[PDB]
Amino acid sequence: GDVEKGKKIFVQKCAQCHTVEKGGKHKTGPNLHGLFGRKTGQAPGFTYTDANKNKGITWKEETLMEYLENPKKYIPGTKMIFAGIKKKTEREDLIAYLKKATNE
Numbered sequence: 168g169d170v171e172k173g174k175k176i177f178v179q180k181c182a183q184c185h186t187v188e189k190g191g192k193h194k195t196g197p198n199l200h201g202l203f204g205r206k207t208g209q210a211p212g213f214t215y216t217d218a219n220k221n222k223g224i225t226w227k228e229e230t231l232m233e234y235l236e237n238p239k240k241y242i243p244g245t246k247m248i249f250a251g252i253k254k255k256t257e258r259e260d261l262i263a264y265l266k267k268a269t270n271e
């Protein structure tokens with residue numbers, strides 16, 4: 168995936184509710200810094216749904232690929248109200264951007 172195409176998708180579709188920077192603020196949704204290799208629902212200082220807390224999978228390329236296609240199907244009862252990214256290549260580009268941006 169292309170990091171530069173990923174940034175653009177992030178700004179257009181995710182930045183409304185999320186920051187990526189170290190120490191960045193919680194908005195509607197949690198700051199995503201350090202996401203990769205962490206379990207679901209682990210950002211300090213954010214109140215998650217029990218569904219997001221208990222899903223019990225590790226965020227990596229494979230799990231983000233499935234989640235971003237249909238967030239409500241993957242985590243039923245999530246309060247992330249977002250339709251998903253249907254195109255595999257848009258998901259790949261976004262995940263490449265997140266993998267860089269969420270550890271600086």
Ligand code: HEC
Nearest residue numbers: 180181184195196207208209210215216219245246247249
């Ligand atoms: C608001 C309208 C949001 C948009 C647009 C996006 N997200 Fe979100 N996201 C939001 C909330 C309220 C939550 C918490 C959900 C809960 O049930 O508690 C989330 C959660 C995530 C997560 C999980 C984080 C974790 O620590 O487990 C991820 C990985 C995530 N969101 C990513 C994401 C991306 C990449 C977005 C654009 C494609 C996106 N979100 C949009 C709120 C909102």
